[PDB]
Design a protein around this ligand. Sequence first.
Ligand SMILES: Nc1ncnc2c1ncn2[C@@H]1O[C@H](COP(=O)(O)OP(=O)(O)OP(O)(O)=S)[C@@H](O)[C@H]1O
Ligand SMILES: Nc1ncnc2c1ncn2[C@@H]1O[C@H](COP(=O)(O)OP(=O)(O)OP(O)(O)=S)[C@@H](O)[C@H]1O
Ligand SMILES: Nc1ncnc2c1ncn2[C@@H]1O[C@H](COP(=O)(O)OP(=O)(O)OP(O)(O)=S)[C@@H](O)[C@H]1O
Ligand SMILES: [Mg+2]
Ligand SMILES: [Mg+2]
Ligand SMILES: [Mg+2]
Lengths: 314, 255, 254, 477, 322
Amino acid sequence: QLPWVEKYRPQVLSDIVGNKETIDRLQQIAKDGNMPHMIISGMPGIGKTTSVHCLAHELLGRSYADGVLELNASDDRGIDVVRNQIKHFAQKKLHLPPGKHKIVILDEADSMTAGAQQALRRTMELYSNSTRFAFACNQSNKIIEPLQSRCAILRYSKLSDEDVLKRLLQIIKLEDVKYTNDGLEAIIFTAEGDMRQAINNLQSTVAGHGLVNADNVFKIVDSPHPLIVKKMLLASNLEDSIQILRTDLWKKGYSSIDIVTTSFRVTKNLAQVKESVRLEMIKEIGLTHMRILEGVGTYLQLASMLAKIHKLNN
Amino acid sequence: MLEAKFEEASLFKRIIDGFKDCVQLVNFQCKEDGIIAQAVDDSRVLLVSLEIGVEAFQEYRCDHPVTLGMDLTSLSKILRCGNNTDTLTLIADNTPDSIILLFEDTKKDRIAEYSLKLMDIDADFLKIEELQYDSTLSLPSSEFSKIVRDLSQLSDSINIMITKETIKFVADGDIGSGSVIIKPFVDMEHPETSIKLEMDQPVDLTFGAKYLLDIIKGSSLSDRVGIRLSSEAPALFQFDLKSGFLQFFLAPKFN
Amino acid sequence: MLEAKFEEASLFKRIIDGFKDCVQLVNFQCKEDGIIAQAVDDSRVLLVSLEIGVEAFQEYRCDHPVTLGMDLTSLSKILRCGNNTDTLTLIADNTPDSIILLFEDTKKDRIAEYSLKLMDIDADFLKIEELQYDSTLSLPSSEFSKIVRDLSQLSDSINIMITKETIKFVADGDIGSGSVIIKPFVDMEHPETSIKLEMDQPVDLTFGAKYLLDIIKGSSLSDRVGIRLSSEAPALFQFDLKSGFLQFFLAPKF
Amino acid sequence: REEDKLWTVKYAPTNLQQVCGNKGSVMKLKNWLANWENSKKNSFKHAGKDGSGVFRAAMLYGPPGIGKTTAAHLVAQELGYDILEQNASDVRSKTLLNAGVKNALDNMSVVGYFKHNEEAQNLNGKHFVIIMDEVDGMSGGDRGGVGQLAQFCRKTSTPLILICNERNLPKMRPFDRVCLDIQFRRPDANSIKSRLMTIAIREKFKLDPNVIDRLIQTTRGDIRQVINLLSTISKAWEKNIALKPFDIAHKMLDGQIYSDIGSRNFTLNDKIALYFDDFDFTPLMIQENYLSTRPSVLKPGQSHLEAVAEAANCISLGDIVEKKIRSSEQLWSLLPLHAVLSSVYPASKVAGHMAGRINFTAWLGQNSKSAKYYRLLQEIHYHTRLGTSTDKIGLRLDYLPTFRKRLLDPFLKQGADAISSVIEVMDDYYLTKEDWDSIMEFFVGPDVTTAIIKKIPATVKSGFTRKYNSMTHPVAI
Amino acid sequence: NLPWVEKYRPETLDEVYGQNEVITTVRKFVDEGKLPHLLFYGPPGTGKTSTIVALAREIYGKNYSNMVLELNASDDRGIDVVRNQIKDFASTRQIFSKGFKLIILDEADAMTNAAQNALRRVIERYTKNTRFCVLANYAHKLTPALLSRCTRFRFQPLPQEAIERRIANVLVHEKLKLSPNAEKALIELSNGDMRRVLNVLQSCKATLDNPDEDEISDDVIYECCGAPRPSDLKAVLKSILEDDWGTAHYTLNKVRSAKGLALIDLIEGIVKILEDYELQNEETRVHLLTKLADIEYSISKGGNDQIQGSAVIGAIKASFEN
Ligand SMILES: Nc1ncnc2c1ncn2[C@@H]1O[C@H](COP(=O)(O)OP(=O)(O)OP(O)(O)=S)[C@@H](O)[C@H]1O
Ligand SMILES: Nc1ncnc2c1ncn2[C@@H]1O[C@H](COP(=O)(O)OP(=O)(O)OP(O)(O)=S)[C@@H](O)[C@H]1O
Ligand SMILES: Nc1ncnc2c1ncn2[C@@H]1O[C@H](COP(=O)(O)OP(=O)(O)OP(O)(O)=S)[C@@H](O)[C@H]1O
Ligand SMILES: [Mg+2]
Ligand SMILES: [Mg+2]
Ligand SMILES: [Mg+2]
């Protein structure tokens, strides 16, 4: 057994799909060599760590094992570490090509305490001749102001649907698996931009049910079927919606958070109703979501949400 | 590139242990004459110079001059490995990114090879020129270390007075004061206990206690330390070696 | 029921100081053939086992085997109070709920009597499985201790390898690297300074540094340690004893 | 090398006439460092013409990336001194501070001596300038660092220069009066613009002044951020990496997007992805420029004002949602909802044609100003608590209107002989001159004091300063 | 002396009830030997811990105490735990055994984002030599990466057949008499929670074990569990619907004060009863549901209880007028 996400992980900078201008910027950086300190921010599962890894690889060639220091969340990153080890690595001697430099890749930089982030300031400022820092964070807000001022900020947009679709087409072509278009559409709907989660769900579907079909996807994801949620939200009589929520969703043991999230994600794609009604239904659904997240996930809240949605649609 | 072979494995160990407390990173300038290395303190108050000539090396090539920037903590961790009966060998390839330390036993085939990653230090090499010091004396390092450890326990400033063929150490602390008077004399029965003195002008200087405590740790290389004091120049402490020397330049305090 | 006399006092001292740090509570099983004990660390990597027969003692008498579970910290604390010239004796009676230790010198009537409390945790799992090992060797404990605490500063993973008549210890970290090679040789002047080695097939495998530092602390027992290395099998570090042994089973890494 | 260095390091200043902005603070620091020797000769008791003779050490503070470290290093090197620098990447505990720097407090340099001592250039070559940088960044691993450094601020014998980012932080309280504290401010747009034009001329590439102004607005004045962002380099660059928030604001406020033909071509998912494009600046931009557009989506019978009112209501709801989100990061799942409430719904309500130009959000500057003034008011209350018996909020609300009538009102009519009375008044409350300026800074409304404070002759202010530097009554503990 | 929670804990696979759908696939996984990283999530009191412990015991037998690391919640939750304990347990090998080691974390949903990132990195590192099985109550409080790296399993609540079989089993090994309506009330209150059933059964046992043979009526179960009675619920609803303000207010106050009930379960039972009425107008249901949800959300923050009770009465009386 082998996770398809790891097996088909991009190793060259060109294999990464999605953002085009930032990938082109990184390509020009790897072609030139003068790479500055950079923070990379974005949503989870969109190719941040892979980007900096392929960048360092293409930059250092046969020197990745000597001039690259990677620190993820599983390693100790305190004050003692950033004071001793990072400083001793920045001062290391290494004969590199005239364009290349050493690389310190700090992943999940938002988890590093402020006291540890304060010490890196002069360490990364004084040794700018043989050391360039690359942070990979989910939130660019937990990084202190001096660090944000020093290094350039690079935001990664969420993945669109055509890019994930092309990546999945490449994967299934190189894997020789049977599929149907509605199955790919279900994968796109469930992934909501997470390329890693998309590949993982596709591999799980292929390994469990063989044929990639919407029924098997919605069975393996263990989430409320979008069709039944659409039927519940678009019903005419409120009693019908309440009965559907009672006997189909609430009885099977679905979590209220899952119900609300599926209703949100289905109302977003309901292209039959107008735009204002969609926005207001999403507003009520989000109000119910915030109410549930505050400790009260009672069925009464979902009933009131359905009542408000029916009153709005009428 | 270079290939140096020390006679004993303890010589370089004692050398590095002499000034591993006042210096953290150091540059070693390897020329055809030998090894010369200078380093400033972290507080920029105590300069350390070290010269080991070719005579202390069993074999030494050094085709062309080179610089090796290295730490003293890792070097002290590595040099502590070898036993007494080993032949330390320093090796550095062309364009060195590291340095090899070989420990070969004379009667056995137990070879212990270590590697050390060189550091990058800007070469702010400043030149030293021979100044005519007013006071130039020399005394056994044991008594000097004793007086330093004695006076440093009272205050944080040791005052040295040279006047009328008399050495005077004094310290004024909060819990009291302390003073020590030394008169020069010669001992034909034991030349290793004889305080020399060549006085030209009465000198009065004041140094810190921490710097003196760090300097006196080098009393294991030689047995007679020389002292050169001037009215306006930094004091010079010197420990001679069978093929070189170790010099501590210490700057006085203010009035 | 249980009367065990020691010939000296420092023997049990070093026996317990051998493995004080790796495990906290241990069960001594005393049978007619002597005292046996086995324990595992909380991390479940190193297994300590000790066996001592009826030859190193002076007067040993027991009717039926008995188990006593005790904490090594307290036993070391109480044992530290004994001199080197006393004769330590352990006595136990029916329904043993407290072990009774007695120090006494023949020329100085100093009755040092001490009672301790016993624990009750017991998980034995005694197994010895592979009598044939790919590589075996025996070397003075002093040299091995020097090597292991010399290469422990450079990294945390010491890689041992037995090639053809070439024992090699490697370490690689951030401050540099270290490689120690030793070759076997038999010295007729002193047998305790020889390097014995037998190699069926070449081997190479890594080990944790802290586990080796904990194992090496039992070097005061003997003057020559035996190492047995074999792939896909736990390595054995054995310190012999006049009437037994103390051996550590260690698990390799990746 | 020549092309391997960063743009911040290669284009760093070299003299004092290249540091853009804050000329007054730089000149004050230079004059203090120059006259430090004369003040040391007089036992640090005669404040000479500037009230900067009694202070042993200096303290630099301000926003990040203004030139604090550069200015300090340059004014230290220009006078021929020798720089001893310590920063946050060194363990500045109490014991280590006692060991290392305390010993080197009054000693002379060895590198400064052996460097040059024969030519009569200056007598201060051997002396030290101890630069304690990033004093605000001392973590919990430096025990007693602030107290020991405050003690070092006194009983010293060499120029000590402290650098921090937030001076009014209560942790920096032990530096109340023992150090001269000059303040760096966000440089004016003209100086940063001139520096950018010089750098671009040297690098041989031209930009539009509108792009320069937009960059200056985006970075909020951090010159280092400006240079680092300019180093990334034209329409594609500004439109995809640098000025993305402006593109988001322009696209989300278009009228043709929310029309039926337009919405079928650009569905709601594209708008939510447009929000996620930059989920830190889109809500602020939308709140900034949502009520400056001529609409084209108004309902049949909806005016502009009620549409803007509904948009602001939904904006407040989205702000509540954002507070709930940032209160606990593990509620990441609430980000899509905050997309619709904060960004998408108001824009949809009031979409149309942009009237003028899209301005950057002004909430960041006002928030920084409000935080600075809150800290200033807390610092003033810390001094005046012993004689008012009022809350830190009621003070600004009630007392200060009367303090204006007491402090500055005499100066406009009595001229320059009422100095004794106002010093007597401000000494019953343990008030100082910096506190006086801070008090006068707060007066918003028809009682604005920034125009009148400069109108008065400079001779009166200088006399007030020199007379106040003589007498002091600050002790109450 | 031991609690019935532990005494009646399933020692094997066949002793878990109402989880056939997951038990078959777990048996396929164990006899195939391809056991992947698992995520057991679902409502509490279902059998996740029991299932995984039984599977580990079946796989390892007596060596279960050697290659199974049972971790728990915070227990001084620093990054040191996930960085050292799990990391060394996964990286270091085992002695006198064959196979891959197993680490099972109890209620691993209380981990922060940084802890979850550390744990997913550890899982990605040693995914070849060990298998992780993490437990959770809500599958939404976990990072999507950690969720994707493993395979999910939702433990649906126990149906009537399984819980009734367990009642029969506990009646075999215990000398107890239970009325036909007592078990009905027990299931209606359990909501599919075996743990609460075993909690309440032994409490009522110790309550009415004078001769070891009394009949456990429904009233004592309701008193030990603290749940409203359907009779009181229907009486309060009828009083609010028909009688005037003073009378209905007095009845509601007396019912919620003489029994010790909170307004939460009152509203819950009242809306559960109102669910199945034959309403004429739909605006009635709309207003009823909306106002009662508002009352519930306000009660969640602890206001003046009498005011919310009067508001409940007012909303019920004002919605039933069309
Ligand atoms: N643009 C992309 N093209 C192709 N594969 C991608 C892309 N983005 C992500 N992937 C896949 O997703 C896997 C995981 O991506 P990562 O970069 O490790 O996630 P991430 O960006 O670091 O976000 P985190 O770590 O969850 S905060 C990669 O190994 C790829 O297989
Ligand atoms: N006035 C200025 N004119 C031109 N460049 C400047 C100016 N101020 C700062 N810089 C640039 O910013 C770089 C470093 O700025 P610093 O002054 O060191 O930052 P800082 O003031 O110390 O703020 P911190 O310490 O990061 S909070 C310099 O190398 C210049 O490239
Ligand atoms: N399916 C079941 N069959 C039999 N007894 C069960 C079952 N589920 C729960 N129990 C009983 O309830 C006790 C608690 O079970 P656990 O597995 O610990 O609960 P859980 O479902 O894992 O969720 P927790 O423990 O509340 S986080 C067990 O010791 C049994 O006595
Ligand atoms: Mg990552
Ligand atoms: Mg700075
Ligand atoms: Mg459980």
